[PDB]
Amino acid sequence: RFLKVKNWETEVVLTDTLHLKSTLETGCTEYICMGSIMHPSQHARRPEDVATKDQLFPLAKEFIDQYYSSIKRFGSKAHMERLEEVNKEIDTTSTYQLKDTELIYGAKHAWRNASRCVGRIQWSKLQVFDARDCTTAHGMFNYICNHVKYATNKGNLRSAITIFPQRTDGKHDFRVWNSQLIRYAGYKQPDGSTLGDPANVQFTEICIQQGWKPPRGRFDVLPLLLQANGNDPELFQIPPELVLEVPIRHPKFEWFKDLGLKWYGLPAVSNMLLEIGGLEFSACPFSGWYMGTEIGVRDYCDNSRYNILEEVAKKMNLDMRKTSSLWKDQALVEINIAVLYSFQSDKVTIVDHHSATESFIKHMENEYRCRGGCPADWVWIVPPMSGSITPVFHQEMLNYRLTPSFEYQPDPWNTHVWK
Amino acid sequence: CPRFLKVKNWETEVVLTDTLHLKSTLETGCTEYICMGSIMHPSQHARRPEDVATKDQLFPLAKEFIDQYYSSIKRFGSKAHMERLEEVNKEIDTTSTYQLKDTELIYGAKHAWRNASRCVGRIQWSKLQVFDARDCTTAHGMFNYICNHVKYATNKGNLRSAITIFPQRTDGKHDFRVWNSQLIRYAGYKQPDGSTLGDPANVQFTEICIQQGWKPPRGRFDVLPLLLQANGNDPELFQIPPELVLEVPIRHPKFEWFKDLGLKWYGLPAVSNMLLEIGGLEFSACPFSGWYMGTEIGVRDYCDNSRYNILEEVAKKMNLDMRKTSSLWKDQALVEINIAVLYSFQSDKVTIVDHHSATESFIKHMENEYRCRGGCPADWVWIVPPMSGSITPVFHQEMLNYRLTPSFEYQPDPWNTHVWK
Ligand code: HEM
Ligand code: HEM
Ligand SMILES: CCN(C)CCN1CCCc2cc(NC(=N)c3cccs3)ccc21
Ligand SMILES: CCN(C)CCN1CCCc2cc(NC(=N)c3cccs3)ccc21
Ligand SMILES: C[C@H](O)[C@H](O)[C@H]1CNc2nc(N)[nH]c(=O)c2N1
Ligand SMILES: C[C@H](O)[C@H](O)[C@H]1CNc2nc(N)[nH]c(=O)c2N1
Ligand SMILES: [Zn+2]
Questions:
Q1: Given CB atoms, is A382 within the 8 Å cutoff of chain B?
Q2: How many CB pairs (< 8 A) connect A and B?
Q3: CATH 3.90.340.10 domain span(s) along chain A
Q4: CATH superfamily of A245-267+290-355
Q5: C-alpha closest to that of A4 among B27, B326, B42
Q6: CB atoms inside a 10 Å sphere around CB B257
Q7: Protein residues near ligand 7, an ion, with CB under 5 A
Q8: In 3-state terms, what secondary structure has residue B391?
């Protein structure tokens, strides 16, 4: 049936028909909701479940059909020939190759279908870099440097994705071992504490084990660890002139710069899997720009990340002896003012959570009008601070899984057998 | 379904194992292909009247509850258990319904709270004062019971959780109902120029009261009268004695001008429009009360755009740059309002809990329920507070949501279904 979602602030009701198109499971049942589970088995893509000639043609036919519907040429001569072309290819090689137009369409729609992404108003503005001719980690490094340079654009960030060769037998995977192209190292200290980003302690140790000489500072850009065609991964240093960073300062608190905080301008996720028409692209780094709260709330103030609230609140001379003084909430706002101010002062693209969630509501309205719906995961869409003063808090959302999609996959060091 | 389901806390790495979901009794709204986790009222969280429960539907619902009760008192399979089952079955046969024992009523009410997946306050669930008002026959009698509840629960600011339970639904034409959404709430008045005075959330109910004969003072914080329906009769208006309504004027520890905003709020949140379901019986009037978490007032009541909507005025008094959203002037004022709310309640010695303490307690409660009960149903969308979400521990806590009985359920507004005499 048609499903209605209401905004409880504006009373707008939208009617969802698009969910009728989905075939992937969510993890919920009629009797249990798993809406807050970060990784049900239905959002991940193991190298176990790579398809076969059997399973592959229906998935391919589904995608070709939706592509030719999207260009208003359903059933055309070009459509019929492409289905026959793809069928013969799967039959004689156990796989098939996307056309360039199909690859671009599939990457844009994987973003459009990402129910956890608040930035999807931009979905049709995506630069797609076809790297399917790559064969070595040196080639991967070259493609990644070009991506970083293009997407950074001297601070005027541009969304981009680079797509490396698809999975074949699961023993010749292309993988970026980094979770993002640009990230900071973390180091376990003798006294038991952590230097740098605690989230990256394990990956940092693998780089050190592979020969990386760590500077052992608080914000050391990690090297790239690149695996091509299932071989052992190889280390590379991104040229530093390509790595745009912002020193964080505060418009009012002159002492804030003395905290020594910085962050990088370019968020570039490199560990997800792109699925298009049954094909699995296990290396597909994609980049956009930051929403301020990603840095100011989560990276800086998560207890398991840089965890700076206590230091900031002390410089603010807040009463920290009782929770009900809301000293953490006060420091949190000031930290997020500093992040936005610093990026804006340096002319590095960033969006605040008020502007981003407002754009997302507009996007939802666009999608319901032209597409009949928009899958959206409230748990991820609502920002991690000031939730109910953003309009998405009051927006009912339906979450469902459409393909093409981005999926999580296992960390390669848990599956890879080395030299 | 699998026997064991695991939830992870992504901050602490603690993994918990849920087996209680196997006892889930009714639907969530989700399917295998869609998640409705952010829908506020899926039809499965509601209860419509006229249909009532039939004889055949009622026995298994009653047996399931009676079994659960005798299991909890470590008397499962006992002589008393089997005799109670026989007594209930015979009542349902001769009268099409049955009456709960006092002990069963208390157990059922406490467990409806324990099972309320959207409540962050459930560490308190076993400390609930249950007032049995099933002997009530008139709206005047309902008023008396409600006044006693308010006085007991308020306790001069040392608030005590309580519930008052009126007679259960029979044929659906004799329902007891409190037409108010909460026992204490402020009126809202639509003005000819489109503005609203008082609380915009309550305009519809305010107009009903005025139509029923309430003379409104037409101020910003007017306590609404009680509109009470006994035995399916037309509802009747009563004024709550003002000495029973504890209120807190809102001031700020630093900003001396904050008191000049003229804000106040009431101390006792007392939901009065939900339905309590125990063993297939439906208690359509069951007002229950606890105490506030501060964000309920400081974030939602005061700062929702469709409520009192005070962010702009507060931000002006703070001399904030209000031209760009990226100055975060809304976020800065929001914190200061919530500091004021907690400071004022604590200064007046009226029970309140901040969102840091409440969520920390809920995590401890959840862990204990997993260890001793096999699980704890929780709705993340409602449990995470409406400000500073990720600096509270519940943001990082995976949760499983499922529906256990006894339960609290929403029900349609009575003015939409009531047959006027
Ligand atoms: C253009 C600016 C963009 C902004 C401002 C933005 C914003 C965000 C934010 C804030 C999140 C939550 C991240 C977190 O909590 O860790 C997110 C998630 C996500 N973004 Fe976007 N995004 C943008 C572009 C893109 C692009 C270009 C892609 C891919 C082509 C993309 C794909 C995704 C996916 C797949 C997720 C969720 C991953 C999951 O399912 O768990 N985003 N986005
Ligand atoms: C003792 C202190 C208590 C605290 C601090 C507390 C806290 C809360 C909060 C903050 C909410 C969300 C309210 C909203 O956003 O509008 C809530 C919901 C709820 N509370 Fe509690 N509560 C307490 C006691 C109780 C009691 C005594 C009962 C019933 C006996 C109860 C039953 C419920 C239910 C059923 C809901 C969710 C309604 C729904 O399903 O939508 N609470 N609670
Ligand atoms: C701690 C991070 N967790 C593990 C999620 C990692 N991830 C998954 C994919 C979506 C995602 C988005 C961001 N941010 C962004 N604005 C963007 C990155 C790329 C395009 S936009 C940052 C991280 C992630
Ligand atoms: C705008 C109000 N919305 C519509 C929800 C009303 N409601 C539903 C039931 C749970 C609930 C809890 C609170 N607060 C509390 N601490 C309590 C009230 C009673 C015991 S604890 C306030 C309101 C509600
Ligand atoms: C347990 C819960 O699912 C988890 O902490 C989620 C909550 N919402 C989130 N939302 C976003 N955008 N990013 C996250 O990492 C998370 N974490
Ligand atoms: C659309 C969304 O479900 C709605 O705004 C919810 C979000 N979470 C909430 N959480 C609580 N505690 N109370 C609420 O009223 C809401 N509203
Ligand atoms: Zn669900």
A1: yes
A2: 210
A3: 16-132+159-169+273-287+357-381
A4: Nitric Oxide Synthase; Chain A, domain 3 (3.90.1230.10)
A5: B42
A6: 11
A7: A 28, 33, 35; B 30, 35, 37
A8: helix
Domain B18-134+161-171+275-289+359-383 CATH (choose: 1.10.3860.10, 3.90.340.10, 1.10.10.10, 3.40.50.10190): 3.90.340.10
The encoded tokens of residue B101 equal: 């024992």
Solved using: X-ray
Place of tokens 């439906």: B282
Q: Which of 3.40.50.920, 3.90.340.10, 3.90.78.10, 1.10.3720.10 is the CATH number of A16-132+159-169+273-287+357-381?
A: 3.90.340.10
Resolution (A): 1.8
Pocket, ligand 1, Cβ cutoff 6 A: A 111, 114, 116-119, 122, 126, 159, 161, 286, 288-289, 291, 294, 351, 356, 380, 406
